[PDB]
Every structure is written in C-alpha cells, then in structure tokens.
Amino acid sequence: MEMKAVCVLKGQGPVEGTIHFVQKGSGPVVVSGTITGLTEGEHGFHVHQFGDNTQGCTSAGPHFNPLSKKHGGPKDQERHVGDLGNVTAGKDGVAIVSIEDSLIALSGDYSIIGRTLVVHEKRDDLGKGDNEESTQTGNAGSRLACGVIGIAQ
Amino acid sequence: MEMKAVCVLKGQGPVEGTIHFVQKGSGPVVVSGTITGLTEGEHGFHVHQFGDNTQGCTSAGPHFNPLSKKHGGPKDQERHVGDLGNVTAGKDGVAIVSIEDSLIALSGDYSIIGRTLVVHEKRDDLGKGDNEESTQTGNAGSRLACGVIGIAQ
Ligand SMILES: [Cu+2]
Ligand SMILES: [Cu+2]
Ligand SMILES: [Zn+2]
Ligand SMILES: [Zn+2]
C-alpha cells in the first residue's frame, strides 16, 4: 500500500526545494513541500520523463507523457501524466507545494519514481495559450531546478 | 522491454562518475561507466535502499535488501540485492565499471530505479570479515559519492 518519495530540487540558480510524496494504496498521490529562491508569482511544475542529470535539467527530456496527449493543467482531461500545473511563490521567494493528483502514481505504469521533477522560470499557461508552445510546455520557460524522484522511508 | 538507467555520482570530495544500467526484459542488469578521483585499489559499490539526498549520502540508508539477508559479495547466495561488490581504481584513480548482475532489476520488486548508488572509501570484504560490520556493509566504510538512479533514454 503506502509508498513515499522525495525529491531534492537543485539548479545553477538559487532555486532549492524539498518535495515529499505519499500514496496510500490506490489513494491519490499527496505532494507536500517547499521551494525557495523563486521570483514572486506562478511557476510551472511538472514531472519530466528521464531521471538523467548528466546535463543538469536539460537531460530530463519532456513532460512524462505515457499517453500521447497535449499539455494541460492538472484538472483538464487533456494533459500529460506529468502536468502538475503551477506553484505560487510569495514575496519571500517561497512556494508551499500542496497538490493532490490521481493521475501520477508512486507504482505501476504511471509511476514517477526515477523521473525528474522540474520547477520553471514562468507560469504554466495550462495549455490554454494560443501558440504551439502552449500545447507542449504550457510556455513555462526555463528549468530553474530539478531533481530525481527517489524512494523514501 | 529494454530498460535503461543512469546515475551521476557526486561527493564532497574528488570522487565523481556517470554509471549506466541496461536490462533486456527479466535478464541480467549490465552496469558500466567510469569513476575518477579514487585511491588506487578496490572500493565497495552498492545500491542503497532510499533515493533520498536530504542528507548527502547518509539519507540513502542501508544496502537495498528486500529478501532480508546478510551482506555478501555478488557471487554469494547470502547477499543483499544491492551488493555489487568492488570496483577497482588504477594508479590514476580511474575505475572502469563493468558488472553484470542477476539480483538487481530496472523494474518490479528488485528495481533499483529511485534508489541510490554509493561508492565507498574502502574495499568490501564481501561479508567474510568475521565481525558483525562485515555482515552489514562489508567494512566498506564511508560513502565517497552517490546519486539517485534515474530512468534513461
Ligand atoms: Cu516542466
Ligand atoms: Cu554501500
Ligand atoms: Zn505537460
Ligand atoms: Zn550489502
């Protein structure tokens, strides 16, 4: 039943974070954590495909997308498995991460264990933007920090 | 059906390396790559239980051990799943890693995805040392470098 994971976000910039995941059986994945050093406002937050850090955050590849879907927010039927939407930083440069997601898992085909969590320079437009980029990355821009999602005690 | 993984080993010291894993179906896992900055001689080399980098290599926990066995060498029946024995650095402090193992996996219960690869200060005595510590860690001593094992393209 009860699975736990951890991710240590690190980057070249001053963005740092610790994210925790817990899933009780078939229950949803509850994500809890903080990110620091952010500019005030919304920042895209996704699970990328590869847990590969040979090229900082570049080697993480694209949004985890085992179904061949277009980019969305967490609530839209049309979304990447990895689409966790946005986290909001305050004027202190800190976001509280508090997400409940049924599509991600810590086991089975949708498991995010050994994939890369990424927080982005800019707001994820949740795939509602006009241009092509919205259907792909939600125009969240740069990868500020990432880590491999690890199994936790 | 082919699965690939990668681990970037990082420490507080001169030891670093990139390790590659490949598993064809339920076959052996082939481990390759290079570690630099090591003292000449044999170094303990294991998969530890947790992919938790919240306290450097310490939060990785003990050897991966889902069958609840004592420590051994990779050829021993009595071994932890994570027991990959020793890598050997030459005069120049380079270890060429070339291992095939039948207990670790890149999927299912023996999966090392989201766990931590550790290279040690000292030789692993392969559980033959005749103190309790041999039966836990092989007297491999401190953790020179580690990384979370991530899904790779
Ligand atoms: Cu992203
Ligand atoms: Cu070890
Ligand atoms: Zn997406
Ligand atoms: Zn062991």
Side-chain angles (χ1 to χ4, degrees), chain B residues 46 63 71-72 80 83 136:
Chain B
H46 329 105
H63 298 177
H71 181 79
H80 302 142
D83 293 342
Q136 295 303 332

Side-chain angles (χ1 to χ4, degrees), chain B residues 89-112:
Chain B
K91 298 278 150 197
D92 54 346
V94 67
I96 304 310
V97 173
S98 190
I99 292 168
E100 167 179 315
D101 193 77
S102 299
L103 256 63
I104 55 165
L106 298 187
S107 97
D109 289 353
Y110 301 91
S111 188
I112 63 170

Side-chain angles (χ1 to χ4, degrees), chain A residues 25-41:
Chain A
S26 59
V29 180
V30 167
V31 185
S32 168
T34 75
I35 315 184
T36 49
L38 286 169
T39 63
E40 193 194 335

Side-chain angles (χ1 to χ4, degrees), chain B residues 28-144:
Chain B
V29 180
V30 176
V31 192
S32 60
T34 304
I35 312 173
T36 52
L38 291 166
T39 59
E40 183 191 338
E42 288 185 324
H43 287 91
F45 189 66
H46 329 105
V47 180
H48 285 64
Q49 189 173 357
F50 306 117
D52 177 331
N53 188 32
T54 63
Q55 194 188 338
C57 297
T58 305
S59 33
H63 298 177
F64 181 35
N65 187 31
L67 291 167
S68 297
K69 291 196 180 178
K70 300 300 193 184
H71 181 79
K75 299 183 168 88
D76 291 316
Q77 171 66 61
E78 188 76 6
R79 58 170 275 198
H80 302 142
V81 168
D83 293 342
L84 302 178
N86 289 296
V87 301
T88 305
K91 298 278 150 197
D92 54 346
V94 67
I96 304 310
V97 173
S98 190
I99 292 168
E100 167 179 315
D101 193 77
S102 299
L103 256 63
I104 55 165
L106 298 187
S107 97
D109 289 353
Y110 301 91
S111 188
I112 63 170
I113 300 300
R115 307 197 185 268
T116 295
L117 187 69
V118 180
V119 59
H120 282 89
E121 71 169 324
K122 285 178 192 302
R123 172 173 193 275
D124 181 338
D125 68 14
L126 309 183
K128 321 290 179 183
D130 292 309
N131 62 358
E132 163 78 5
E133 191 65 40
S134 183
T135 81
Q136 295 303 332
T137 68
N139 288 291
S142 71
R143 309 183 180 190
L144 302 179

